From a paper:
TTYHs have been reported to form Ca2+- and cell volume-regulated anion channels structurally distinct from any characterized protein family with potential roles in cell adhesion, migration, and developmental signaling. We conclude TTYHs are not pore forming subunits of anion channels and their function may involve Ca2+-dependent changes in quaternary structure, interactions with hydrophobic molecules near the extracellular membrane surface, and/or association with additional protein partners.
To test this, we purified and reconstituted [name] into lipid nanodiscs without Ca2+ and in the presence of EGTA to maintain low free Ca2+ concentrations for structure determination. The trans-dimer therefore bridges two opposing membranes over a ~130 Å extracellular space. The trans-dimeric interface is smaller than the cis-dimeric interface, burying 908 Å2 compared to 1556 Å2 and is largely polar with eight intersubunit hydrogen bonds (between residues D166-Q316, D166-T320, Q169-T321, and Q325-Q325), π-π stacking interactions (between F173-F173), and nonpolar interactions (between I324-L329). The trans- and cis-dimeric interfaces are partially overlapping with residues Q316, R317, T320, and T321 each contributing to both [name] cis-dimer and trans-dimer interactions. As a consequence of this partial overlap in interfaces, cis-dimerization and trans-dimerization are expected to be mutually exclusive. In mouse [name], the RGD motif (R164, G165, D166) is positioned at the distal tip of the ED within the short linker between helices EDH1 and EDH2. Indeed, the RGD motif forms part of the trans-dimerization interface in [name]. In contrast, it is exposed in [name] cis-dimers and monomers with ~250 Å2 of solvent accessible area presented to solution by each RGD.
Author numbering:
A (entry chain B): 39 to 71, 89 to 414
B (entry chain A): 5 to 73, 89 to 414
């Protein structure tokens, strides 16, 4: 497709540049066949190592901030589903069992049958409203897949770049020791190692540039991409709300939440009336009605927590933290690492050009 | 079981062969205004007139024979007339008591129906006006919290159901009007009949005393010119026998099938089922109002449970709403006590007892009164016939 075009072209351009550098080095070597230069090379190598370490630490910080934000937006999408499941299970099992028990107890008098039927219908309305809330089990799994795969990839890349930094430090120390030891032949015969580290630096620059351009593209219009990837799988209204949380935007769950809370209030008023007028009736029903009000109290508290949880402020803040982290920090770190790789390539080219000259 | 049973005398009286005016069989179907039944009843008057004519011509023949071809007869005639007047007075008092028993029973039934209608009207007006006004005030007060709109609407729907159920109760205005009219008519007719027959008894006693004085005064001409009055009172006695026999036959026909006729009278203004229930109930019937009363009292229970719950959970809101909510519970208390009184009223025991009192006061009392009054008429006719027969023979 046209999306792969930029990445593939940049990769092939970097590969062709590395090949051209190798051919030029071979031509220079076949054509061929200082303390100040040494300190200059050491200073440039130290500067490149510092730049690379800072960029790698920056990218590490950013890609663990991204994982933290993913795991803090995953916990909310799990607690919300837990609350919805708990409320649905409660009203489906405990309330129905208790109301059936109460009806069996006080079926002797048929006046309260009408209000018991009305409260049964209100419980059914509550269950229907609760089922209307979206299930996040298809987004939680996605945020687990990302939170695991990105962590693994970041750890592997971090280990690889620490290995590269260690190799560069080792080669610099070996060069310094060889210079101090009057340029031992075996010590100074590391032209193959120089070629290998130069091609590794070129490949690192290629990968850094490819990742930088890819993340820049995916940060150019992040909302559209996230809507086309997962926002299409789920209802687009909820994604629209969570993404661009704003005061002007009307909440998508306000109607369902207000109907559910009104139904809870109506059930509470029926239960209170039954409690007050059940004193003339058998007091064994008040034992069950106390459980009914316990269920209603717990449901009201859970609903208040849930409506404090669907609020777009927290999710929008977590999403913005994740986006700022990945985009800004990763772009800065990858640019720093690309500069590091360019510095290493130039230093290695200069060393190769001045290798036989010093020898 | 307590119920209406036809006594032997009323069925025996009904057992006489009914005839039309032209001597042809007529059915015993009771019909106060129908032509054939009115003619059948007038046939008894015609027969009594024929009997009076036969007695008059026989007496004339006897007097002519004894004139052309002394105090024992006068004493016998006077004693027989006195006994006849005694029997007539007893019968008249008995049937007067029967008619006023009917009047009292009708007034009692009318009062119960009026109370029923008043309770229904009061409850319907209360639900239409007071509950709705108080609910409007309460909604205006607590519109700040939008949750209670659902329960207010539900209990307003309960109010609509209550009004619809109450409107289904029968309206007794027509029945009360009919009962009042019938009571007025019965009181008027009974008073006039009682006064007329006391007048007749007094006139007969005066004629007997005049006979005694004339006999004791050696047949004074001014006390011997009483034969005209004697003939007039004899024909009056025969007309009284006509009227007594006619009324006895009519009321025996009624008493043969009382409940069927009562159902026929008001078989369209009100549902026939409730009329049948009031007329016939000894142990237990379907009680057609029971379903409506149960649904209405259930609706009141839901009313009051909504109001109690709203009272309990409206104290977090300012208690200004309680000034209306306690009034609402006052309305529900009054409605519940009124409904209990009403369901006590709709029980068929009271109305059936009133109906059975009216039916006994007619069947078992007026029939005997009319029978003894007809016996008075026969005895007075015979006594005055003998007295006139002994008139010319005395001198
Ligand atoms: C991201 O969210 C998912 C679910 O939305 C989380 O997965 C769930 O994690 C909990 C607790 O870690 C699991 O409960 C328990 O897991 C243990 C295994 O550690 C198991 O032996 C217990 O029986 C119990 O199930 C739960 O199973 C798991 N899965 C689901 C579908 O709820 C996850 O922890 C969150 N964080 C990350 C980084 O993925
Ligand atoms: C028998 O029951 C009735 C029902 O309550 C008692 O009230 C009387 O109801 C009749 C209805 O036919 C009233 O007659 C009407 O009076 C109005 C004037 O108010 C007149 O315009 C109509 O044309 C009709 O005649 C009657 O007035 C009313 N009586 C009273 C005192 O309110 C009735 O009293 C009961 N009968 C007895 C003897 O208690």
């Amino acid at each position: 497709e046209t999306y792969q075009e930029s990445l593939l072209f940049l990769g092939v351009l970097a590969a062709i540049g590395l090949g051209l550098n190798l051919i030029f080095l071979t031509v220079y070597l076949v054509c061929t066949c200082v303390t100040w230069t040494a300190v200059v090379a050491g200073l440039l190598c130290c500067a490149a190592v510092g730049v690379g370490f800072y960029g790698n630490s920056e990218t590490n910080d950013g890609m663990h901030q991204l994982i933290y934000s993913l795991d803090n937006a995953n916990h909310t999408f799990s607690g919300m589903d837990e609350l919805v499941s708990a409320n649905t299970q409660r009203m489906k099992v405990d309330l129905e069992q208790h109301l059936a028990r109460l009806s069996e107890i006080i079926a002797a008098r048929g006046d309260y049958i009408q209000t018991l039927k009305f409260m049964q219908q209100m419980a059914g309305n509550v269950v229907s409203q609760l089922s209307g809330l979206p299930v996040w089990r298809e987004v939680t799994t996605q945020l687990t897949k990302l939170s695991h795969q990105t962590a693994y990839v970041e750890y592997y890349r971090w280990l690889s770049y620490l290995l590269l930094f260690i190799l560069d430090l080792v080669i610099c120390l070996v060069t310094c020791l060889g210079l101090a030891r009057r340029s031992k032949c075996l010590l100074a015969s590391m032209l193959c190692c120089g070629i290998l580290t130069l091609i590794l630096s070129w490949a690192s620059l290629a990968a850094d540039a490819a990742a930088a351009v890819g993340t820049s593209d995916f940060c150019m219009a992040p909302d559209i991409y996230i809507l086309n990837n997962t926002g299409s799988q789920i209802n687009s209204e909820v994604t629209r709300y969570y993404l661009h949380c704003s005061q002007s935007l009307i909440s998508p769950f306000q109607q369902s939440l207000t109907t559910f809370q009104r139904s809870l209030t109506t059930m509470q008023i029926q239960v209170g009336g039954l409690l007050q007028f059940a004193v003339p009736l058998f007091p064994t029903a008040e034992k069950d009605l106390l459980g009914i009000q316990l269920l209603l109290n717990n449901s009201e508290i859970s609903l208040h927590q849930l409506t404090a949880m669907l609020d777009c402020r927290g999710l929008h803040k977590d999403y913005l933290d994740a986006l700022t982290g990945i985009c800004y920090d990763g772009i800065e770190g990858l640019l720093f690492l690309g500069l590091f790789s360019l510095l290493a390539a130039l230093a290695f080219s200069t060393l190769t050009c001045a290798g036989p000259r010093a020898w």
